[PDB]
């Protein structure tokens, strides 16, 4: 099982002027489902099993 | 050279001091993987 | 049901016999974390996020969790047919 | 209210008192969301849900 829990993340530098929309950005696609169209059609491609 | 790095890259204390990193694309864990044994275990076959 | 994931899990692994299952084994929908809010502008927020950011890499919360966030079953006789599989055999004298 | 809801503009639960300057401070079990980011500033998750 899994023992480091740590998501991935865009970073910059310091006192960027993206640091506030950038953020809301992400978060907006979480919710609409387009995380969605993206994991599926690259990670699970399905084979196998 | 660059501003945004746009790549996997995991968040802990030590990055964090120097530059923030904005919200997770996703989350993830640490594992660990080890080959596949014997496709066709017991292989000794009849007359045994 | 449709609710917080983490609640709904809890109490799932929790039940008598773990007869109630979530749908497809624990799938998810919109992976958004906890927090805790703080006023705007607020300057406690650079160094808190340090602190909670330092407990990660000390694995304190992943053992904290088992005091209790841990369940009671694992999410996997009775000899009798009673047609079951045997129709095909029948279905083969068909 | 529990968990805060936006009415008339306006915002009750745990997330009602610390836009109204009453809390400066709010823990428990938060879900992070765009409507919620605008008015406070969420730090870092540290659970998935
Ligand atoms: C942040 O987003 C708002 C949304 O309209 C926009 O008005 C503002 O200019 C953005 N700020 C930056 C620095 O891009």
Known sequence: ?49 | ?48 | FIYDAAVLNYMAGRDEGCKLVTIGSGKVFASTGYGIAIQKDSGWKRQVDLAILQLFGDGEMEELEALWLTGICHNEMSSQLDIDNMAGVFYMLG | ?49
């Not at chain 2, 996997?8 to 993987?33: H, M, V």
């Not at chain 2, 014997?38 to 009849?46: G, K, N, Q």
């Not at chain 4, 809801?5 to 745990?14: D, E, F, R, S, V």
């Open chain 1, 1 to 49: 099982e899994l023992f480091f829990r740590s998501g991935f993340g865009i970073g910059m530098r310091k006192d960027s002027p993206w640091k506030q929309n950038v953020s809301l950005s992400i978060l907006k696609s979480h919710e609409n489902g387009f995380m969605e169209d993206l994991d599926k059609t690259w990670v699970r491609y399905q084979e196998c099993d």
């Open chain 2, 1 to 48: 050279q660059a501003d945004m790095i746009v790549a996997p890259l995991t968040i802990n204390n030590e990055r964090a001091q120097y530059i923030e990193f904005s919200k997770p694309f996703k989350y993830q864990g640490l594992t660990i993987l080890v080959k596949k044994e014997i496709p066709r275990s017991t292989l000794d076959s009849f007359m045994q």
């Open chain 4, 1 to 49: 209210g529990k968990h805060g809801k936006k009415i008339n503009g306006t915002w009750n639960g745990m997330i009602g008192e610390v836009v109204m300057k009453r809390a400066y401070m709010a823990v428990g079990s938060l879900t992070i969301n765009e409507e919620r980011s605008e008015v406070v500033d969420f730090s870092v998750p540290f659970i998935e849900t």
